Every structure is written in C-alpha cells, then in structure tokens.
Prior knowledge:
Elements: E1 5-6, E2 15-19, E3 23-31, E4 34-37, E5 47-50, E6 63-72, E7 86-90, E8 115-120, E9 136-141, H1 145-151, E10 160-163, E11 180-183, E12 186-193, E13 204-208, H2 213-221
Antiparallel strand pairs: 1-9, 2-3, 2-5, 3-4, 4-7, 5-6, 6-7, 8-9, 8-11, 10-13, 11-12, 12-13
The structure holds cycloheptanamine and calcium ion.
Residues 171-174, 176-177, 191, 193-194, 197, 204 line the site of cycloheptanamine (SZ1).
GO molecular function: endopeptidase activity; metal ion binding; serine-type endopeptidase activity; serpin family protein binding
Domain Peptidase S1: 1-221
Family: Belongs to the peptidase S1 family.
Amino acid sequence: IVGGYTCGANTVPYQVSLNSGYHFCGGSLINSQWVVSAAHCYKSGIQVRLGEDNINVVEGNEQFISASKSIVHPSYNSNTLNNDIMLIKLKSAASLNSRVASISLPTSCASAGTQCLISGWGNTKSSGTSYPDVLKCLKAPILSDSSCKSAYPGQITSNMFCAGYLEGGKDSCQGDSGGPVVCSGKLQGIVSWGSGCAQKNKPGVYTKVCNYVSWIKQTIASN
Ligand SMILES: NC1CCCCCC1
Ligand SMILES: [Ca+2]
C-alpha cells in the first residue's frame, strides 16, 4: 500500500496473508473454512495465516492453517486478468473471534463514489521498494467506469473496477495482490492489477466481487 496508514493490530480481522515460505499475497476470510483471493495468486503449498499484524513476528493472535484445495475461476484469463478470483479452502476451520472474522459478500454491486478500505502488506513505495511488516490500510473511492476505461483503454472488462486517485500517490502495490476492498462492510473488490503503483492517471484495478457471488456460494456448497 502506497500513501496509506498503519491499520493497527487486528483491526482488519478478515485480512489474511498467504504464505509459501514467505508472504506473497493477501486474501479475505469469507467463512470459517474459505478464503477469497486473486487467481493470479494461485500456487501450490499455500498456508493461510489469519490474525496477523506483523507478518515477521509471532504476536499471539495468529492461526496458521494449510490450504486443502484451491479453486481458480473457470474463466480466469491470466493475460487479460479477466475473472481474477480464486477460492482457497482451509484444511481445518478457523476459530472465529474479534480478531479473526469473516467479511460478508455483497448483495449488490457498489457504485462509483463509494468509499472503501483497501489493505495489505505490499510495497509502500511507488518508485523503489520497501515492504512493511505490519498491515497497511488505504481509504479510497470507487471510480466511474468511464474514468477507469479512459485510464486504461481496451483493458477494463465488466468484471473490473478502478478505485483510488487519478492524481496518484495513494494505491495498492506489489504484495497487496489478492487482498480486500471492503465498502460498507461488504467485500466488493480483490486487489488485481494496475500500471505501476500510485502513478498519475493509473489507479488500481480490482476484481468486481459482486459478479461472482453465485459462483462463490455454489462452489462453497459443493466443495
Ligand atoms: N495496484 C496494483 C496492485 C496489484 C499488483 C500490481 C501492482 C499495482
Ligand atoms: Ca505475526
């Protein structure tokens, strides 16, 4: 997260870190045994880490649970990043509490102008590299479809939205991939892609979760 703030320990209780020897992606806990992330975060050997703040120190509220399976969206295209969504099932159910909690799926899509919370352990620099150990947060509005399409001609599908600031300076970045965009207590987006981070007229692009609610529910119900 570039141009954000330190969230505070366990203030984003649905935020997970995906770890394969190291943090490589964010995710969102949607019930006791399932996490939603980006399809471009797919890999084998995933351990889901819940209750994290400092991802380099065991602080006492963590639960470490290996994934039993991952399900990438059937229509995910890794070239265009259309349908950039994946479900991860935990080998055992997480113990839910104030610091480890699921985030509700949307019942309807969020509109341009809606204020959202974006979070993750990604790069905090727009040029060069610095990775924070503690969770970073960014408050950012959803942008209009027209401004999103104007920013990224030929690349924005009906399964994507832009959020952030056309002036730059505030954005998600490398390592935030797969993490949450939460608006009015609902998971509306997944950190997906962008051209660099925090660059003028290149806001972050996010997977439009409301389009996938039926798929998520049905997949969970049979897996
Ligand atoms: N805003 C994006 C975050 C996802 C990873 C690519 C970097 C820029
Ligand atoms: Ca920790």
